[PDB]
Design a protein around this ligand. Sequence first.
Ligand SMILES: Nc1ncnc2c1ncn2[C@@H]1O[C@H](COP(=O)(O)OP(=O)(O)OP(O)(O)=S)[C@@H](O)[C@H]1O
Ligand SMILES: Nc1ncnc2c1ncn2[C@@H]1O[C@H](COP(=O)(O)OP(=O)(O)OP(O)(O)=S)[C@@H](O)[C@H]1O
Ligand SMILES: Nc1ncnc2c1ncn2[C@@H]1O[C@H](COP(=O)(O)OP(=O)(O)OP(O)(O)=S)[C@@H](O)[C@H]1O
Ligand SMILES: [K+]
Ligand SMILES: [K+]
Ligand SMILES: [K+]
Lengths: 544, 544, 544, 86
Amino acid sequence: QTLLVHGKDAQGIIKQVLSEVYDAVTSTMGPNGQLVMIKNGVSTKTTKDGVTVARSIRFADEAHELVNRVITEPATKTDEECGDGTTTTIMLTHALYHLFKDFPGFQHHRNIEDLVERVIQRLESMAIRVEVDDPRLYQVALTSSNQDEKLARLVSELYANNKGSYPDIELKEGVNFEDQIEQTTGRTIRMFYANPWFAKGHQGGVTELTGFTAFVIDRRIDKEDTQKLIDGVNHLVKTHKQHLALPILLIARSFEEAANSTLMQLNAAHPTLVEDGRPWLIPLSTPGTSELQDIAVMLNAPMLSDVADLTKLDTHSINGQHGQLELGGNRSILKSTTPKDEDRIEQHARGIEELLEGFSLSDKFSVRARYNERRIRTLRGKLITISVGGETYSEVKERVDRYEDVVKAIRSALENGILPGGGVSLVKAVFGTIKEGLEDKDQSAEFAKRYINSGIANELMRLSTIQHKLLFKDTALYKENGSFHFNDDWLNTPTVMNLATGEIGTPEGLGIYDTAYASITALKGGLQTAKILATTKTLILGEK
Amino acid sequence: QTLLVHGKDAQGIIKQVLSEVYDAVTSTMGPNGQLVMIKNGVSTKTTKDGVTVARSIRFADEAHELVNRVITEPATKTDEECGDGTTTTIMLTHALYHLFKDFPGFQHHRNIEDLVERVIQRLESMAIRVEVDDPRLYQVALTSSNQDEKLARLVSELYANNKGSYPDIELKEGVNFEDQIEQTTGRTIRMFYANPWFAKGHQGGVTELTGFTAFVIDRRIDKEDTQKLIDGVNHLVKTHKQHLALPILLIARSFEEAANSTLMQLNAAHPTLVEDGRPWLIPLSTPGTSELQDIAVMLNAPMLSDVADLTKLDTHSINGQHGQLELGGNRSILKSTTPKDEDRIEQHARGIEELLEGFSLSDKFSVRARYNERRIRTLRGKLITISVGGETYSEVKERVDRYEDVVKAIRSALENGILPGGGVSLVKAVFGTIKEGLEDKDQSAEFAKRYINSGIANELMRLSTIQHKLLFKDTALYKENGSFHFNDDWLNTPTVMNLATGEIGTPEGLGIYDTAYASITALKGGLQTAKILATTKTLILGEK
Amino acid sequence: QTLLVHGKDAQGIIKQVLSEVYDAVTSTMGPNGQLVMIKNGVSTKTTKDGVTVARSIRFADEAHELVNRVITEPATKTDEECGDGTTTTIMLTHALYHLFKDFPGFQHHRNIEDLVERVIQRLESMAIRVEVDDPRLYQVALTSSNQDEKLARLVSELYANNKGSYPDIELKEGVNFEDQIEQTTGRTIRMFYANPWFAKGHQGGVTELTGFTAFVIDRRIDKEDTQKLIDGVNHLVKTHKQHLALPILLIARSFEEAANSTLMQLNAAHPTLVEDGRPWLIPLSTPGTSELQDIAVMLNAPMLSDVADLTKLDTHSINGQHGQLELGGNRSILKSTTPKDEDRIEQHARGIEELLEGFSLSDKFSVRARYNERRIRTLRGKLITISVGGETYSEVKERVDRYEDVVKAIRSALENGILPGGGVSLVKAVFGTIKEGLEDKDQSAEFAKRYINSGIANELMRLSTIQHKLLFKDTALYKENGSFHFNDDWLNTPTVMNLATGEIGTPEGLGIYDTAYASITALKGGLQTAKILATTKTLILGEK
Amino acid sequence: ELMRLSTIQHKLLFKDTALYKENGSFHFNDDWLNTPTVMNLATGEIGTPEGLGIYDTAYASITALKGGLQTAKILATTKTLILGEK
Ligand SMILES: Nc1ncnc2c1ncn2[C@@H]1O[C@H](COP(=O)(O)OP(=O)(O)OP(O)(O)=S)[C@@H](O)[C@H]1O
Ligand SMILES: Nc1ncnc2c1ncn2[C@@H]1O[C@H](COP(=O)(O)OP(=O)(O)OP(O)(O)=S)[C@@H](O)[C@H]1O
Ligand SMILES: Nc1ncnc2c1ncn2[C@@H]1O[C@H](COP(=O)(O)OP(=O)(O)OP(O)(O)=S)[C@@H](O)[C@H]1O
Ligand SMILES: [K+]
Ligand SMILES: [K+]
Ligand SMILES: [K+]
């Protein structure tokens, strides 16, 4: 009817939509959540998973849907990178929106943003670190998997045994009832075939090799670079044939169909070097330039900027390895590595760690630091392939998902940090931030005027409670004395209820923990999305 | 209109749907049931069978249908594995749902689950076993077939005569008025042709053989294993030709179209061994790895993991049998077996029985034990092919179904257990479980507090009555003294009414019996489905 | 709107539908019936025939139609086997339905069934037999044909002249005004051509033969038996050529297109035996295995189970007849039969009659006995072909139908039995059954308690009246003294009104008779259909 | 049924109080019959009707139940109402 919506009408719809989503999702929070039945054509999808709920919600009107997609996509993006924290995000989205509405005037919006930012900074400082030898890892594994004895014990011991190198765990569909483990080196890499022709059997098979001579290229290769490939390859085969171990690996960013067809002819050009059907030249692709530098260090390959640099080479630069490599369609795997090669890789790993030593406190939790930590795991770390078993085929597939969540949780736990659960960490952060600025006599004049005296602090303290209310409302804890009392006594020793067992105690005592990155991203993502929904006064539905 | 449904609305619809299904199905229970007319395009399907009713119910709204499919599929799955117990299942689904509604608070849901679980445990202990020499088998056969003199007598004698080996009964469409029996050994197997070409006549016919040399493979064979088949076959024909009885049988899990085409050429490669058109090499498929181990023991074949193991073989491993086998499109049949071969098969059968001897009480009724008992019947047991006759063609087809239900009932009867019918077994179980915990002085403090004092026990005792009410309401039994009195006098000697005859007495006296697995699965399936329907507060209808 | 119908709603619709059908059909009963106009696209079909009415009734709603098809098809099935009794059936369907409704409780339903069953038994005992020399046959022929002098006289004399052998009458479209008769032997058989190629002219013509050598096969012949046919045929032509009369007839159950193509080549293989274009080998099909045994006895052919038995034969088994046979597209006809062959056929006919002599009273009216009596008519009995004439072409076609009904009536009359018409036989049966049990002092205690004292007998006595009411309401008979008086005086000498003439008297005196099988089947079919309509409480309209 | 009906006075007085809050509903066992606990609504404390001092006159509760039975029977058995003024 009306494509242009402005005024009281837009903000009315925004609050309407937000309300309906908030009820649907927040109901699924915790082990004591209520289930949702989703239709997907003919079948029924009954689930309690928050991210599945948020993704699957549809509306009738276009206006309503437009608003929904602003809430959905930032929440969906949290589980793609971390793995946990969507419901929490959406909860707070309502929470902070409500706040922005009570305090109008664009000076107050500034005051709210600055206050919450400082709360984030306290959360990052509150972040607790944990080692592989500590029994806390078993507690987190038991909570994330919804109480399993065999699953939590196996992964915890696996990280405990490999004291030094962080083990990488990958999964597969098993046939046996019992689970089977393969403790191997298997240094995982991010390279794979450009074209199916280059593998053993000429149909994208898994080629195993016992010797190679790798060369890393930086540029994306297309039809323009077809001339330089013929120049570089024939130079290497003719001149430097003495110091060479077949096959020659041309690792790069991307290989186009024009370049791949040229390299297929170059394999056919020299048929003498073809041993048992294997092509002696293989181009390899990788989906952040320093990841290729890791690939160069692992395989003792020289780093090359241009394609024309392949001609100007020598015995000093060219080094053919005699290890063991396994090329694949999805990824490559390096198994056998000599003590001489490991000395080079460990020294390069220390160099990245020395950069992380010099970083600041706030920069340690950034994307720059997390990317550098990802490079360390690729270089140092043993690969463990677990074929997950079960009674039926459906149970095997279900158990793989339960295995995957435990691995993703434990890895991110020791990486970033751990905080006390049951919606306590948020309460401690807020009550701390208000108390910190008020206690400090230098800035107490302005700190009180902006936040405390205006009433924003009071409101923000009530909003931290929201997670704690929703989990434990209509339970043994909240039954006593009407509402809950958030006094100084509670701040020192915070009590919660373990919903799995039933007993009452501290989040530290009972063993209820959340990852640091999940709660931080939720609050960061919550602030930005809440501001946008609040400040938006106009909606356009007209298709151009 | 609204794809998202939440609140009082969802649970209202759930109860609405459940009510309509409960009325439709429970009306068909017992011999005194009322018929249902089903349309299926143009024809009318008049039936009293509960599973047919549940499958055929459709609704107009998508919301209503969504709920229906949660009730239907678990009930439909009971008749696929057992053969009886759907109405009973659906009955209790309403029953336990109603219970969950009266006692809110997720602590009470836990209390209900634990209580019912213990009732299941009493039902498993109450399970009575029966032998082939006992006249009770005639009573069960007479009840299941809805009173037939010739049918019940014939099957009961058939199990009674073969005292030791459990006879397998298979059916076929006959031409004569009288029924005809074929008492043969005919050791049934789970193997059949991979491709129609390999049979006699080259069009999937029934090939009879008098000598063979079998080889069992574990892996699923595809295009990748085509090389190893040519290596293994030509090794066997060239080297080990002296100790060989044609034809060679390659039994495996699955044969792809790529592998079958390769083996067709290998038959054509050696035309000297082809006798009267029969191909000398046949690949065989089977739809749980230990079933192939049974196939290996029957035919004296060596168990092989890999396809490459066919090369590395000797006279010690290779053993060509001189019995009699009948290959087929659906299944294979082994008839002639020497006393030397039967000694090997019986010794292997004892080994599986020795594993069942060491199992626990609860583990004996599990899927693990039932699968092992299925292997015993395949190894030891004579096959009896009965060509069922009648007056017309329609009566022959109808009588085959009546024959099939009797066989499925009698086999599962002596396998698992038998309980007293007329909805008595459930009442005895519940009243027993309440009395057991209350009498035991150690746990009486908490047992009373959770179940009895809260009023769940009282409610659960009224719910066991439901089967007994529905069968015998508006009869001679219920007419006296308004309602029925469930006192200690009734618990000792429970009276029922046989609906077929009319007389009054005990379920043991009159001969009304139910299989153990049916009533157990109904209550197990009832608890889980009832909890889900109760805890579900949300419905989604939006197609992604 | 609602696919699921349950409760008061189903039974309401059932009574509604039943009522509308009952009014439409029962109005057409008797010569004083009212006509119905049926549309069938563009033309008008004005008829008084009950079966045409029942078949042609359609409804608007699917629910209503669903109910209709339960009433229609059992009534339609009565005219397919007997030829008369549909209206009567449908009448009683309403009658017994009404009964079942007055007496609820599944014990009373049992009481009603047992009572009516005994009434059937009295009807079977009441059945009167008649001979060909008796003038009663003229009376029945006059009633069935709706008063015709020439038609009733001709058929009655035809059965009277052939005293011993029951004559078979077949019809054809004539050209002359006068009717023409062909008194010939023409022993009718149930065999015809498998393929049109095998006849004279090679296009399914009428082949006349004067000599043959028949062979009867039991099995259905297909592509599997193509090998044994070539073995059997060439054995007979080569070895046993001396004792053979052409052509060779291969009589069987069914001939597939694969087998027929093989036998066509075998005719071409031996062209020396082909006389004037006639193929010397003919396969013959027949649409109950003992009908082929009759075919074997007629033609002196050996009975053969398997196709391979054609090889193992001798001069003792093989016997080539020198009679006269006429093969055809619809049926074959055997005309000339020697005194030697008739001695064999008559002796076989006595053997079937000796089996009918030893049968019980209840077994004599069964399908088993009727099938055996059908075999006697095929063996012994002269065929009479009457070319029916008339003034116009439309009158010839109409007269053929009037001829056919007279033949079907007279044949079934002397076969089963005759009872007094005007709805008297049913009244005598019911009043007799009530009086029989009450008079017998041994069982009078329970007989009174179940039927008489409860009031079922009283009700059943009113229901027998229904046929008598509907025929003679608003006539000279019912005009006197308000209603009709069913006293002991009427039971001794029952009076009726002949609707054709107008005069008053006994059904025996006036000549109003019904066939036994029609009234029995109506009441048998009425009881079963009435019970189903009564006990059905549910309707399903949802297409799967 | 009659045992559930005696509870009615006890439910109406003490529903949504400290006594009924614990363990969902109230448990009328043999332990309670020996020493019956109530809540004094004036003060707030919990104890026996004898201990706290909550007493009813005999004639009041008797007349209530006597009067209750007769009036309840009449209301139940009455199937007809006439409103027409003569
Ligand atoms: N056993 C437990 N007892 C009490 N509280 C718990 C327990 N387990 C988890 N929690 C709390 O509930 C929260 C768990 O979050 P979820 O309900 O999984 O929502 P979410 O993590 O946003 O949803 P996702 O990302 O789709 S798995 C944590 O923040 C804990 O504080
Ligand atoms: N002759 C009988 N007299 C009294 N009770 C009977 C008789 N036969 C069976 N029963 C009872 O009725 C139940 C039979 O179940 P059914 O009516 O067949 O329902 P169901 O087994 O769930 O339906 P299915 O699985 O589709 S055959 C048993 O549990 C018996 O207790
Ligand atoms: N001339 C007659 N006078 C009196 N009653 C007759 C006469 N002819 C027949 N009847 C009676 O009416 C009945 C004849 O049945 P119809 O009206 O033909 O119904 P119907 O036989 O069920 O219908 P069909 O099978 O389609 S021919 C018999 O049962 C007789 O009792
Ligand atoms: K969750
Ligand atoms: K049933
Ligand atoms: K008629």
